[PDB]
Write a protein that binds this DNA or RNA. Structure first.
Ligand code: FES
Ligand SMILES: [K+]
Ligand SMILES: [K+]
Ligand SMILES: [Mg+2]
Ligand SMILES: [Mg+2]
Ligand SMILES: [Mg+2]
Ligand SMILES: [Mg+2]
Ligand SMILES: [Zn+2]
Lengths: 162, 45, 176, 97, 38, 222, 154, 84
RNA sequence: ACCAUAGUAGGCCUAAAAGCAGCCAUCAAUUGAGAAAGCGUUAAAGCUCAACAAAUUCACCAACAUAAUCCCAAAAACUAAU
């Protein structure tokens, strides 16, 4: 990993990049012939938003997500990983990946409401004032359709809209 | 084949070996051959 | 402050259009151009078009450089026709030999457009041929006086038919 | 290159570029040099001199800039990318102007 | 703004952006190009 | 540096005289003084007439069924004429002039008395029938631009299609029907009279194979 | 499908066919690297159209020509050739200077007239030089002068 | 009011002298030299219609020169539906 | 992203038609760039898009307002289901 250092020394600015040692991939994957990293370790259709140990290897230190070009994930899996990271952050997990702002932490606000499997964002959903009867029912979404292909040990389909 | 490594002037210390062996070959000749070598060079150049 | 592309007759800078409104818009009087350009060339007949480059400076001063005339005037004069063909391709306006195109090449080879690039002699002649493609004048390998004369009579008859047709066409539009 | 033109390079006194073209980590320096030496950037002040120093065994691709205020911006670009170098150069112009 | 059904770019400077759960056409040069999906 | 792909060459296409669309009369020259029943079987089901290209290479394919009257003809004619190049484009009608009368009784009167007076004339159009066929020496991309506008304003849903595109969607309607992994299909159940389903289905559903319901055609049903 | 084809290893790579344009550049690069004694590389810089044309005219006065070749057909060619050591100079934007009967005294002078036109390096008579080598080569006398002084020293 | 100067109409002089070449008042008509003295390359150019796509050769820059021109024509036609 | 130079105000046309009312032709310099794809000008000038080079994740298409006494089972994405 590379980091940028900017130093001010008597009206003179020096900017330089330093290389930090980077952890490497594990030696033996179960499926050496795979293309994308997800299917190389037989992780296809076997991860969810709870799997922090997996979603913490495809995100930036400040909560952002790395581009698909660097990681090498396929387009189908990259969107699923992107969706899980968004759901993971809203769920309260990954507390060390937030930006540091000393001035904003002191003015506390209303206590955080615990949530999980939030498809949308908290500030972009409007109350369902007129729900409706059973023949035309406005169903609150839970989870994402991108995760409907995950393995179901019970065998019953996941209820995405409820 | 390949070309040379393009040495720089920061640490210029390695002269071509073809020149060095020419120096040894020239120095390995008698004065009579010096005149013959000189006359041929003068006639050609 | 900019560059002005103007075609002016040799030593015939008039105090009006198209020189007046264009050159005077940048803030340069015409009387200045009535002395600079007219005295710039005095051995060139008036009435011959001359594409000139005018560089207007921020202090309202100007610089003038004169180039070779346009290809259109050279080929029309070489073919002896007063104007180009109205319908290029359908009709041939004038007939010229390869000498006229080749001889024009040397005259335009010293133009600032071509001489700066140091283009070969084959480069200029092809451009003149290409310009002749849209000008209506066909390049001929070689012809004589009688072959050229026959074309003149045929062109005159077709021109005369069009000249009288235009007069009738104008009359129809006005009356109707 | 287009970014520098819009930000007014007139407040820049002198820019020099020192790099070894035969090295492997000088591609970023080359891209920075071509962006700052573009025609659009040039046509902003007719006194600034752009110097392209070329060496072989220097092994230190560096860029040095002097602003009108009098600050010395020197960034040794060997691991930095072209975008980072331009962004840092562009940022200082607004502050020191 | 202009509440419309389908969003189209009237000039090449219009850029799409999704805010508050809806797609907005925001334009910098011409403010009259601002459009809002309903 | 990129690859210089060859460009299509169109030199064997001849532009016929009067390439613009022919005017269509509002009413047929000989009016029909006898009012006939409003057949609805002329819309239901697939089309059997004018399903293949004759001269041109582009056409508007009618996915659904509907009625075209003189108003729609004017919209099709005016839009194409002012948007195409007469030197490189020629268009041909694929539907006849309006001939079927439509009856409208007087405003606000009690039911009964009989059929009213003839109001206007319409042209029945089934599903899969080309409407306007265009050809020329130009590529499909530019022709598609101003044909979707005409197809959008038609009553029935329609698309702008060409020779290659039409075959591709017909060669995909067969592959999707051959590789289907569902053991039961509408064709198998209806014909064999399984579950006594003939009491619910219509006799025309034997031929429609379940792809047609009323005037609506759903191409995704196998 | 049991396994998605994306996760499966890719099919055998189709053999790409070189077109005429690519093969035309292959022989022109071979030609310009064969009959020309001086090959000087440069970093192409976006200059004014009038200034760029002026540079062409000035180099024409000393019989010096300049050509531009894309890296798509030049890097593979130089890799298999004997000038593989010039690959680091052909990574980014580049410009090639071609001359017969090499003489860099009138070439460096034009280059030094524009302070933002770097001279990376090049090969002169199958000998790779840096900018400093070019400067030393410029101040060096010609063959007649050097050989004329050679007999004096001997 | 601005018109080109009167041109020669004699076929004999036009076939032997190019009047339009001499634009100087003090200059004179340049006499035609024998065609043998003329360089041979001026009798080799395509006098007639321009070369088509097939008359050229794939192993020649002329084919790619014309194919490049055709690509621009194809791109221009497809751009007729610009809304910007 | 980057980047724009030749014949040349092409002929004709018009009060003026300079790639950009229309007609006609659509050749040609340069490794590279259309007698022009769009904007603009009274006409010019000018901006932009194709072509140089540089460079290379992917990018066809899929957006649609509201009713009157008070919303309307409560709630739930995995412990094994022909
Ligand atoms: S390529 Fe197999 S899961 Fe990504
Ligand atoms: K519709
Ligand atoms: K015009
Ligand atoms: Mg060309
Ligand atoms: Mg471009
Ligand atoms: Mg409303
Ligand atoms: Mg209740
Ligand atoms: Zn806009």
């Amino acid at each position: 990993f590379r980091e940028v250092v900017e130093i001010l020394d008597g009206k003179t600015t020096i900017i330089e990049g330093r290389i930090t040692e980077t952890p490497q991939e594990s030696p033996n994957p179960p499926n050496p012939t795979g293309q994308c990293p997800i299917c190389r370790w037989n992780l296809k259709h076997k991860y969810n938003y709870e799997d922090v140990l997996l979603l913490s290897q495809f995100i930036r230190p400040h909560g952002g997500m790395l581009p698909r070009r660097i990681t090498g994930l396929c387009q189908e899996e990259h969107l699923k990983i992107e969706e899980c990271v968004k759901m993971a952050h809203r769920a309260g997990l990954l507390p060390n990946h937030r930006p540091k702002l000393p001035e904003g932490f002191v003015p506390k606000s209303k206590p955080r409401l615990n949530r999980y499997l939030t498809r949308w964002s908290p500030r972009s959903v409007k109350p369902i004032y007129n729900k409706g009867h059973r023949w035309n029912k406005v169903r609150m979404p839970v989870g994402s359709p991108l995760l409907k292909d995950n393995v179901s040990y019970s065998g019953r389909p996941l209820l995405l809209y409820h | 084949e390949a070309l040379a490594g393009a040495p720089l002037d920061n640490a210029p210390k390695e002269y071509p070996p073809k020149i060095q062996q020419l120096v040894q070959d020239i120095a390995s000749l008698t004065l009579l051959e010096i005149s013959d070598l000189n006359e041929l060079l003068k006639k050609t150049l | 402050s900019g560059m002005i592309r103007a075609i002016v007759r040799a030593g015939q800078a008039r105090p009006g259009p198209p020189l007046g409104p264009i050159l005077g818009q940048r803030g340069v009087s015409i009387n200045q151009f009535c002395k600079e350009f007219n005295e710039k060339t005095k051995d060139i007949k008036e009435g011959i078009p001359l594409p000139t480059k005018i560089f207007v400076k921020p202090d309202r001063t100007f610089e003038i450089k004169i180039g070779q005339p346009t290809v259109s005037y050279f080929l029309k004069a070489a073919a002896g026709i007063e104007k180009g063909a109205r319908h290029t391709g359908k009709e041939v306006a004038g007939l010229v030999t390869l000498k006229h195109v080749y001889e024009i090449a040397r005259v335009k080879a010293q133009d600032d457009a071509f001489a700066l690039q140091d283009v070969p002699l084959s480069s200029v002649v092809r451009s003149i041929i290409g310009s002749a493609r849209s000008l209506g004048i066909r390049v001929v390998k070689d012809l004589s006086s009688e072959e050229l004369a026959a074309f003149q009579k045929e062109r005159a008859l077709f021109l005369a038919a069009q000249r009288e047709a235009d007069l009738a066409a104008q009359a129809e539009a006005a009356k109707k | 290159a287009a970014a520098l033109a819009r930000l007014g390079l007139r407040a820049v006194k002198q820019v020099r570029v020192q790099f070894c073209p035969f090295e492997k980590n000088v591609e970023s320096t080359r891209t920075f040099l071509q962006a700052v030496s573009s025609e659009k950037v040039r046509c902003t002040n007719l006194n600034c001199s752009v110097i392209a120093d070329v060496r072989h065994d220097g092994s230190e691709p560096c860029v040095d800039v002097l602003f009108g205020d009098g600050h010395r911006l020197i960034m040794r670009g060997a691991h930095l990318t072209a975008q980072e170098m331009l962004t840092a150069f562009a940022s200082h112009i607004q502050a020191r102007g | 703004f202009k509440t419309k059904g389908v969003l189209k770019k009237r000039c090449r400077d219009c850029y799409l952006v999704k805010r508050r759960g809806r797609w907005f056409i925001y334009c910098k040069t011409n403010p009259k190009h601002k459009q809002r999906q309903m | 540096f990129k690859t210089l792909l060859p460009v299509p060459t169109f030199e064997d296409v001849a532009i016929p005289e009067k390439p613009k669309l022919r005017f269509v009369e509002r009413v047929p020259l000989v009016p029909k003084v006898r009012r006939e029943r409003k057949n609805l079987s002329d819309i239901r089901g697939p089309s059997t007439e004018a399903t293949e290209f004759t001269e041109g290479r582009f056409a508007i394919l009618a996915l659904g069924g509907g009625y075209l009257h003189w108003g729609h003809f004017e919209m099709m004619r005016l839009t194409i004429n002012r948007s195409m190049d007469p030197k490189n484009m020629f268009a041909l009608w694929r539907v006849p002039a309006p001939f079927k009368p439509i009856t409208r009784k007087g405003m606000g009167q009690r039911m009964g008395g009989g059929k009213g007076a003839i109001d206007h004339y319409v042209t029945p159009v089934k599903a899969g029938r080309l409407i306007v066929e265009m050809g020329g020496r130009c590529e499909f991309k530019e022709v598609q631009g101003f044909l979707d506008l005409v197809a959008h304003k038609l009553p029935f849903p329609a698309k702008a299609v060409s020779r290659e595109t039409l075959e591709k969607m017909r060669k995909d309607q067969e592959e999707r029907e051959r590789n289907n992994q569902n053991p039961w299909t509408f064709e198998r159940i209806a014909t064999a009279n399984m579950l006594g389903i003939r009491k619910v289905l219509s006799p025309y559903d034997l031929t429609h194979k379940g792809r047609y319901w009323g005037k609506f055609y759903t191409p995704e049903r196998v | 499908p049991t396994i998605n084809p994306r996760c499966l290893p890719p099919p055998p790579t189709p053999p790409q066919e070189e077109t005429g344009l690519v093969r035309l550049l292959r022989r022109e690069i071979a030609a310009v690297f064969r009959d020309n004694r001086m090959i000087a590389v440069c970093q192409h810089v976006a200059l004014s159209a009038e200034d760029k044309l002026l540079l062409r005219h000035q180099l024409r006065k000393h019989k010096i020509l300049m050509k531009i070749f894309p890296n798509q057909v030049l890097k593979p060619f130089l890799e298999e050739s004997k000038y593989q050591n010039l690959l680091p100079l052909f990574v980014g934007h580049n410009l090639l200077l071609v001359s017969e009967e090499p003489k860099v005294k009138e070439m460096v002078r034009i280059l030094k007239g524009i302070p933002f036109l770097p001279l990376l390096g090049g090969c002169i008579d199958d000998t790779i030089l840096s900018r400093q080598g070019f400067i030393n080569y410029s101040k060096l006398p010609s063959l007649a002068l050097v050989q004329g002084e050679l007999v004096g020293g001997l | 009011a601005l018109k080109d100067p009167e041109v020669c109409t004699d076929p004999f002089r036009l076939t032997t002298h190019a009047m339009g070449v001499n634009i100087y008042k003090e200059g004179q008509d340049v006499v035609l030299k024998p065609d043998s003295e003329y360089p041979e390359w001026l009798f080799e150019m395509n006098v007639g219609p321009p070369k088509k796509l097939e008359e050229l050769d794939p192993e020649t820059r002329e084919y790619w020169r014309l194919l490049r021109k055709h690509n621009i024509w194809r791109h221009n036609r497809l751009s007729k539906n610009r809304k910007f």
